[PDB]
Amino acid sequence: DAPIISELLCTVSTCTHSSDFGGVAVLSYKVEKAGRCDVHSHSNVAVLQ
């Protein structure tokens, strides 16, 4: 039922040593069908908001 995408051509933009949200990473992809998808890290270094 959810979006089934591939070729996840992502990237980064710029990064700071803040304590709040000061690392911005734009990421691109191909839309197969519009919806919503949830993101999550898989290591302990980087949290997401």
Binding site: T14, T16, G22, V24
Partner: protein, 49 residues
């Protein structure tokens, strides 16, 4: 944001200083001087007519 520069003292010469600051689009400043009077101090010895 603390940033310094070294500009020349010539009337009308347009000087540019570029600032690479994080988390924002970079910035450009321009400055030019016109009336750079060297007003000296003074003292007195006597008069004459």
């Amino acid at each position: 944001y603390e940033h310094t520069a070294v500009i020349p003292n010539q009337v009308g010469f347009p000087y540019k200083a570029h600032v690479a600051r994080e988390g924002y689009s970079p910035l450009t400043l321009q400055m030019q001087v016109v009336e750079t009077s060297l007003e000296p101090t003074l003292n007195l010895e006597y008069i004459t007519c």
